[PDB]
Amino acid sequence: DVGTVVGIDLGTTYSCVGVFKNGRVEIIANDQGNRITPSYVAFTPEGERLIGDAAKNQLTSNPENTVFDAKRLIGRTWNDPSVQQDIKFLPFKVVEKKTKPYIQVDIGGGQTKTFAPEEISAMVLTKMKETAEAYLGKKVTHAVVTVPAYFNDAQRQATKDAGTIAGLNVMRIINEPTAAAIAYGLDKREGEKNILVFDLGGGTFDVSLLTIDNGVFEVVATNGDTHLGGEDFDQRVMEHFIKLYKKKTGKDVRKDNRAVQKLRREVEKAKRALSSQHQARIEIESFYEGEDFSETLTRAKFEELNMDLFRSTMKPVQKVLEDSDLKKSDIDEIVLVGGSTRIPKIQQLVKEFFNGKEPSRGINPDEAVAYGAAVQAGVLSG
Numbered sequence: 326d327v328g329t330v331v332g333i334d335l336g337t338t339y340s341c342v343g344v345f346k347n348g349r350v351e352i353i354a355n356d357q358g359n360r361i362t363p364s365y366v367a368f369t370p371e372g373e374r375l376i377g378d379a380a381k382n383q384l385t386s387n388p389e390n391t392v393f394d395a396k397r398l399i400g401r402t403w404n405d406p407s408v409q410q411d412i413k414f415l416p417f418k419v420v421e422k423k424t425k426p427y428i429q430v431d432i433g434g435g436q437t438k439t440f441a442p443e444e445i446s447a448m449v450l451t452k453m454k455e456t457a458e459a460y461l462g463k464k465v466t467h468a469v470v471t472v473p474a475y476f477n478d479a480q481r482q483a484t485k486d487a488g489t490i491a492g493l494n495v496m497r498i499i500n501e502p503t504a505a506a507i508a509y510g511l512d513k514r515e516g517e518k519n520i521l522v523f524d525l526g527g528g529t530f531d532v533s534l535l536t537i538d539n540g541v542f543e544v545v546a547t548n549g550d551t552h553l554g555g556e557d558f559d560q561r562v563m564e565h566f567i568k569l570y571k572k573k574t575g576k577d578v579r580k581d582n583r584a585v586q587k588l589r590r591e592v593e594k595a596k597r598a599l600s601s602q603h604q605a606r607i608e609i610e611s612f613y614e615g616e617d618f619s620e621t622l623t624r625a626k627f628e629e630l631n632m633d634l635f636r637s638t639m640k641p642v643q644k645v646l647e648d649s650d651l652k653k654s655d656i657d658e659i660v661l662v663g664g665s666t667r668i669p670k671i672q673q674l675v676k677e678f679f680n681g682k683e684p685s686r687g688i689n690p691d692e693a694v695a696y697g698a699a700v701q702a703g704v705l706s707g
């Protein structure tokens with residue numbers, strides 16, 4: 326009894342779930358009305374577990390018991406140099422247990438608990454499963470889950486294991502760039518094509534070179550930047566206004582965690598607005614020492630603050646082409662994935678790199694990966 330199989334994009338910062346119903350893909354909104362769910366887990370001092378939006382929106386109220394970025398640790402050993410580097414930037418405790426990086430949190434009443442990365446990802450998957458069950462009005466037991474194309478055996482197995490813990494039979498593990506290509510129907514075409522998938526997420530940047538031959542895919546090469554994403558663009562804008570505030574008032578706003586988070590939230594809203602407007606107002610009531618903040622950010626200033634970061638996305642694209650023994654003219658399809666690809670400067674740089682070639686468009690870049698996973702889930706549902 327596979328019932329309705331769900332397609333899940335289990336992302337580093339955000340996750341997305343789809344189902345194939347009545348001849349089309351349906352991306353499912355969670356209990357907060359959002360078509361994407363933060364891959365966040367929070368342990369409150371009352372012994373309650375919060376997942377997704379509720380966990381992310383409570384992060385500032387004590388940051389050591391809010392867990393995120395588990396995807397950076399999943400299927401990795403504790404002594405992996407990538408884990409040893411990542412834990413330096415993570416606010417919650419990571420300890421060595423059974424050779425792996427276990428996440429250590431306070432669960433209330435002086436109780437400390439330890440969770441494997443796949444246990445944290447299983448909580449995110451349980452939330453995705455509940456979002457789908459609330460929509461379908463039936464139990465969900467099977468899934469197609471996506472992973473980055475660079476994921477090794479242990480990472481793919483720990484992702485399946487996260488599914489098992491969540492009460493999901495992970496029938497297929499599919500590569501994220503392949504799922505995005507499927508969303509665009511590139512698997513349902515006769516002939517041979519070279520696809521460049523440009524995936525700029527919340528915290529990661531992945532570039533993948535795929536070949537498609539009569540519905541058959543091959544990942545030829547992968548590259549990117551494991552620590553480059555939308556969150557880094559927000560940070561550059563934050564640093565800018567923190568320095569401007571210190572110059573205008575003489576006050577260092579970084580002492581107050583609430584002030585910094587208020588700026589962070591408003592900066593992320595202004596950034597998103599700048600993808601369709603040339604100016605956005607950043608307004609914060611009682612920002613610091615009861616004083617209001619009111620500043621404008623132009624798209625031109627947003628672009629210059631992030632110019633090095635945006636242009637740096639070009640280097641991995643040149644690297645994949647070299648590793649694939651291909652030239653720019655050999656690319657038949659350019660697929661943009663990740664919410665950060667909405668940035669006009671990002672779309673402009675990709676277009677300029679490919680000498681005016683327009684990328685594939687029309688599928689929401691935050692949902693493209695879950696969309697493709699849901700197409701495959703539809704074939705498995707019967």
Ligand SMILES: Nc1ncnc2c1nc(NCc1ccccc1Cl)n2[C@@H]1O[C@H](CO)[C@@H](O)[C@H]1O
Nearest residue numbers: 526527555556596597600663664665667668691
């Ligand atoms: N229009 C956008 N311009 C620039 N960057 C964007 C945009 N949309 C998103 N995301 C999706 C989204 C849409 C509406 C409301 C909330 C959200 Cl999160 N991003 C960025 O994509 C990353 C992963 O969502 C984040 O860094 C996010 O800040």
Ligand SMILES: [Mg+2]
Nearest residue numbers: 336526663694
């Ligand atoms: Mg993604």
